[PDB]
Amino acid sequence: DTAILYPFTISGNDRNGNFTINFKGTPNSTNNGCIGYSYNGDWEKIEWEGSCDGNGNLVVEVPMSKIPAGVTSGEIQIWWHSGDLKMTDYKALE
Numbered sequence: 337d338t339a340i341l342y343p344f345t346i347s348g349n350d351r352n353g354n355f356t357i358n359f360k361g362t363p364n365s366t367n368n369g370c371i372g373y374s375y376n377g378d379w380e381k382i383e384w385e386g387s388c389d390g391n392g393n394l395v396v397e398v399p400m401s402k403i404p405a406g407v408t409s410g411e412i413q414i415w416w417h418s419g420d421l422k423m424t425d426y427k428a429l430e
């Protein structure tokens with residue numbers, strides 16, 4: 337079914353560590369999606385995928401260095417979720 341989009345905001349200048357996204361979902365599910373943002377007038381996507389563990393938790397990490405400096409916002413997208421999946425929270429962490 338339908339893609340789920342979550343607007344995010346980050347530092348435009350701090351590129352230390354990892355964009356860290358926590359999802360809660362059906363235990364043992366498969367899921368995938370992206371982080372999407374505009375840079376230089378163009379839409380760019382960094383894909384993620386992962387399975388929820390036995391507790392229904394999924395942590396996705398994307399290194400910050402993959403996102404150009406000067407980008408401060410975009411969308412976390414869920415594309416495929418075998419069961420249920422929600423994004424509970426995100427931040428840049430080291």
Ligand SMILES: OC[C@H]1O[C@@H](O[C@H]2[C@H](O)[C@@H](O)[C@H](O[C@H]3[C@H](O)[C@@H](O)[C@H](O)O[C@@H]3CO)O[C@@H]2CO)[C@H](O)[C@@H](O)[C@@H]1O
Binds near residue numbers: 337372
């Ligand atoms: O095929 C993968 C999935 O694609 C989903 O569509 C998303 C596109 O992949 C994504 O590029 C597009 O991005 C938008 C963004 O949401 C918007 O704010 C910006 O203004 O423009 C971008 C488009 O250039 O978002 C869509 C989600 O709406 C499908 O919905 C999904 O079924 C499919 O698996």
